[PDB]
Amino acid sequence: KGAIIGLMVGGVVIATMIVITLVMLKKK
Amino acid sequence: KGAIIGLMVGGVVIATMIVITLVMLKKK
């Protein structure tokens, strides 16, 4: 059941990538 | 097995909170 954790540890990384935009947008 | 996903969707949120610091640090 490594597929479950694999995605788990992956989501976080993606989630951290989306916010990186929210930041740059602070100067919209 | 709701505990697994519960943490999954939670990690992302936490992960997104840690980076929020990395940003503010850009002006270290």
From Swiss-Prot, chains A, B:
Source organism of this protein record: Homo sapiens
Function noted in UniProt: Functions as a cell surface receptor and performs physiological functions on the surface of neurons relevant to neurite growth, neuronal adhesion and axonogenesis. Interaction between APP molecules on neighboring cells promotes synaptogenesis. Involved in cell mobility and transcription regulation through protein-protein interactions. Can promote transcription activation through binding to APBB1-KAT5 and inhibits Notch signaling through interaction with Numb. Couples to apoptosis-inducing pathways such as those mediated by G(o) and JIP. Inhibits G(o) alpha ATPase activity. Amyloid-beta peptides are lipophilic metal chelators with metal-reducing activity. Bind transient metals such as copper, zinc and iron. In vitro, can reduce Cu(2+) and Fe(3+) to Cu(+) and Fe(2+), respectively. Amyloid-beta peptides bind to lipoproteins and apolipoproteins E and J in the CSF and to HDL particles in plasma, inhibiting metal-catalyzed oxidation of lipoproteins. Promotes both tau aggregation and TPK II-mediated phosphorylation. Interaction with overexpressed HADH2 leads to oxidative stress and neurotoxicity. Also binds GPC1 in lipid rafts.
Gene name for this UniProt entry: APP
Protein name: Amyloid-beta precursor protein
Family: Belongs to the APP family.
Assembly description: Binds, via its C-terminus, to the PID domain of several cytoplasmic proteins, including APBB family members, the APBA family, MAPK8IP1, SHC1 and, NUMB and DAB1. Binding to DAB1 inhibits its serine phosphorylation. Interacts (via NPXY motif) with DAB2 (via PID domain); the interaction is impaired by tyrosine phosphorylation of the NPXY motif. Also interacts with GPCR-like protein BPP, APPBP1, IB1, KNS2 (via its TPR domains), APPBP2 (via BaSS) and DDB1. In vitro, it binds MAPT via the MT-binding domains. Associates with microtubules in the presence of ATP and in a kinesin-dependent manner.
Residues of the full protein shown: 699 to 726 of 770
Post-translational modifications: Proteolytically processed under normal cellular conditions. Cleavage either by alpha-secretase, beta-secretase or theta-secretase leads to generation and extracellular release of soluble APP peptides, S-APP-alpha and S-APP-beta, and the retention of corresponding membrane-anchored C-terminal fragments, C80, C83 and C99. Subsequent processing of C80 and C83 by gamma-secretase yields P3 peptides. This is the major secretory pathway and is non-amyloidogenic.
Disease: Alzheimer disease 1: A form of Alzheimer disease, a neurodegenerative disorder characterized by progressive dementia, loss of cognitive abilities, and deposition of fibrillar amyloid proteins as intraneuronal neurofibrillary tangles, extracellular amyloid plaques and vascular amyloid deposits. The major constituents of these plaques are neurotoxic amyloid-beta protein 40 and amyloid-beta protein 42, that are produced by the proteolysis of the transmembrane APP protein.
Spans traversing the lipid bilayer: 4-24
